[PDB]
Every structure is written in structure tokens, then in C-alpha cells.
mmCIF file of C-alpha atoms and ligand atoms in Angstrom:
data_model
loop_
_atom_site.group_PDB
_atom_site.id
_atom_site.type_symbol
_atom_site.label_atom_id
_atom_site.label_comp_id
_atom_site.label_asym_id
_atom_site.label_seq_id
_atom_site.Cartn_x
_atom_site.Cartn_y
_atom_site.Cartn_z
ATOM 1 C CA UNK A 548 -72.529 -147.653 111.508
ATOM 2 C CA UNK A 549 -72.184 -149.608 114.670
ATOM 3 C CA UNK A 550 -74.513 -152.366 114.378
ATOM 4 C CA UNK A 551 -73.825 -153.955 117.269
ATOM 5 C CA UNK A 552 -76.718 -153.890 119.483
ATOM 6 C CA UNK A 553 -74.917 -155.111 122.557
ATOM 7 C CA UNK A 554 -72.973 -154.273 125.820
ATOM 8 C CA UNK A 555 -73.170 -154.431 129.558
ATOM 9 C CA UNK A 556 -73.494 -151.245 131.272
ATOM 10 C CA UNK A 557 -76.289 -151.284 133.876
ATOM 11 C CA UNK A 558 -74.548 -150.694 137.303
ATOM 12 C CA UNK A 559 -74.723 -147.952 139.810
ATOM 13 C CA UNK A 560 -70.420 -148.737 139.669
ATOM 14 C CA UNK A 561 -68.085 -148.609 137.140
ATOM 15 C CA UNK A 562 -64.368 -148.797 137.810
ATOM 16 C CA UNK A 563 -62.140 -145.914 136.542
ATOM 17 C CA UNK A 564 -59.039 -147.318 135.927
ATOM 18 C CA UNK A 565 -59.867 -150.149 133.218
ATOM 19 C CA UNK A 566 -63.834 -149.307 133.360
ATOM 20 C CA UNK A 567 -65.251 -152.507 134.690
ATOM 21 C CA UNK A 568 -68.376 -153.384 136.407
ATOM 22 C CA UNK A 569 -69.275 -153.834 139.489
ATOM 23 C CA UNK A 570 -73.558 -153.906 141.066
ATOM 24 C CA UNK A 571 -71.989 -153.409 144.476
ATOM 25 C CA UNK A 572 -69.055 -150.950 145.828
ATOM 26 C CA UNK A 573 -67.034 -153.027 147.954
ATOM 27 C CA UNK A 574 -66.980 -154.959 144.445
ATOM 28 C CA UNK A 575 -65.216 -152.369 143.071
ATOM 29 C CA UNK A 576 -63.042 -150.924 145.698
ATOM 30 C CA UNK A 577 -61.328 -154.524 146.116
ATOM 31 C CA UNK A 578 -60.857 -154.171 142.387
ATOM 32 C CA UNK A 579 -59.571 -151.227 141.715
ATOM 33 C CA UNK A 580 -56.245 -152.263 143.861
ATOM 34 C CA UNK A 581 -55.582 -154.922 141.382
ATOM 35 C CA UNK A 582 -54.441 -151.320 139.616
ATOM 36 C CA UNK A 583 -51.800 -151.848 142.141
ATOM 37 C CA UNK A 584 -48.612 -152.298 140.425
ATOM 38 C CA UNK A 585 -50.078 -156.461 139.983
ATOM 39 C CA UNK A 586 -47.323 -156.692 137.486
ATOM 40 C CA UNK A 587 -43.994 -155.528 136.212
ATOM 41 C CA UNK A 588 -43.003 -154.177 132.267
ATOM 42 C CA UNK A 589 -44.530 -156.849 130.363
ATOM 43 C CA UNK A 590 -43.639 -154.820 127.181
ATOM 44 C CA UNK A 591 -41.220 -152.997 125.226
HETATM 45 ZN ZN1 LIG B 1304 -60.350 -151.715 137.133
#
């Protein structure tokens, strides 16, 4: 049982990439570059 009881989720936008938030577009559209290659292979 998930008694949790909490957790934003109330905009019209919701980016697709990482799922983020955003109450206006433009918001989100200058967000969703950062899914841009921001970064190189910070794994392995
Ligand atoms: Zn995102």
C-alpha cells in the first residue's frame, strides 16, 4: 500500500522525456532541449 498521499501533477504540460512539469508551453519546449545531448557517458 502506497501511503503516500503526495505528488505534483496539476499542469496542462508535462514533459516526455524525463516527465517534468511545466504550467506554461514555452516552459516546456525550452526544456525539453536540455534532452539535447547536455552531457557525455557519465557511466559505465
Ligand atoms: Zn524533460
Amino acid at each position: 500500500g502506497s501511503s503516500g498521499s503526495s505528488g505534483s501533477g496539476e499542469k496542462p504540460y508535462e514533459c516526455n522525456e524525463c516527465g517534468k512539469a511545466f504550467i506554461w508551453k514555452s516552459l516546456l519546449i525550452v526544456h525539453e532541449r536540455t534532452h539535447a545531448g547536455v552531457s557525455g557517458p557519465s557511466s559505465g
